[PDB]
Amino acid sequence: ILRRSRSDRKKLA
Amino acid sequence: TILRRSRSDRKKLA
Amino acid sequence: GAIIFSAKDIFEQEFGREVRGYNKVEVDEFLDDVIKDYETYAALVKSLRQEIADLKEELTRK
Amino acid sequence: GAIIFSAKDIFEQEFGREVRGYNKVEVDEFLDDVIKDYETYAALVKSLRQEIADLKEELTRK
Ligand code: NI
């Protein structure tokens, strides 16, 4: 949340 | 410049 | 200015998929390092350009 | 130093292939612009740090 990573954008489900 | 990764012949170096 | 992307743009960038494409996890892990570099460079330039402004204000005055 | 990659590293980076991976053309054309920013940022920090060194030399001497 304070350090952007593209895996934070993987589908939740 | 020379570092255009989309050069069609990039594979000649990298 | 002369910079094309922000870190934000690296984070948001999406790519379509093709039949035999780049490994996505590898691209995305790579881009995560690119994000860090854009964050670092942007912070370095802000600090350097402010330092310069401040040193010039000092030098050019009594 | 604090930077992970050079522009040359972005150009030379290899990725595996996978079925349903990222479109290589799209990733590469995006990395074209990333590379240009790495070149610009490297040149910017160099220009700025060199100017700072010159201003400090002027300021700290008679
Ligand atoms: Ni200046």
Residue numbers in the entry:
A (entry chain G): 28 to 40
B (entry chain C): 27 to 40
C (entry chain A), D (entry chain B): -1 to 0, 4 to 63
Sentences from the paper on this structure:
GpsB has emerged as a major regulator of PG biosynthesis in low G+C Gram-positive bacteria, and its homologues (DivIVA/Wag31/antigen 84) in Actinobacteria play essential roles in hyphal growth and branching. To gain molecular understanding of GpsB function, we report three crystal structures of PBP cytoplasmic mini-domains in complex with GpsB, the first structures of a PG synthase in complex with a cytoplasmic cell cycle regulator. The PG synthase arginine finger pokes into a negatively charged cavity situated between α-helices 1 and 2 of GpsB and is fixed in the same orientation in all structures, just as the phosphoryl group defines the binding orientation of peptides to 14-3-345. Therefore, the role of GpsB in the bacterial cell cycle is that of an adaptor, docking PG synthases to other cell wall enzymes, scaffolds and shape determinants into protein complexes for division (the divisome) and peripheral growth (the elongasome).
Synthetic lethality studies in pneumococcal ΔgpsB suppressor mutants revealed that pbp1a, and not pbp2a, became essential in the absence of gpsB indicating that SpPBP2a is the class A PBP regulated by SpGpsB in S. pneumoniae. We found that the cytoplasmic mini-domain of SpPBP2a and many of its orthologues contain the consensus sequence (S/R)RS(R/G)(K/S)xR that resembles the Bacillaceae PBP1 SRxxR(R/K) motif. In this instance, each subunit of the SpGpsB dimer is peptide-bound. Peptide binding principally involves two arginines but each SpGpsB subunit recognises the peptide differently. The importance of SpPBP2aArg31 and SpPBP2aArg33 is further supported by their sequence conservation and FP. Although SpPBP2aArg31Lys had only a 2-fold reduced affinity, which probably reflects the ability of SpPBP2aArg33 to compensate for the loss of SpPBP2aArg31, the binding affinity of SpPBP2aArg31Lys,Arg33Lys was reduced >25-fold relative to wild type. The arginine complements the cavity best when the mainchain amide protons of it and its downstream residue are accessible to form hydrogen bonds with BsGpsBAsp35, LmGspBAsp37 or SpGspBAsp33. This scenario can occur when the arginine is either at the start of an α-helix, such as BsPBP1Arg8, or at the i + 1 position in a type I β turn, such as SpPBP2aArg31, which explains why free l-arginine does not displace pre-bound PBP peptides from GpsB even when present at 100-fold molar excess. The interaction was lost completely with SpGpsBTyr23Ala, SpGpsBVal28Ala, SpGpsBAsp29Ala, SpGpsBLeu32Ala and SpGpsBAsp33Ala mutated proteins and reduced with SpGpsBIle36Ala.
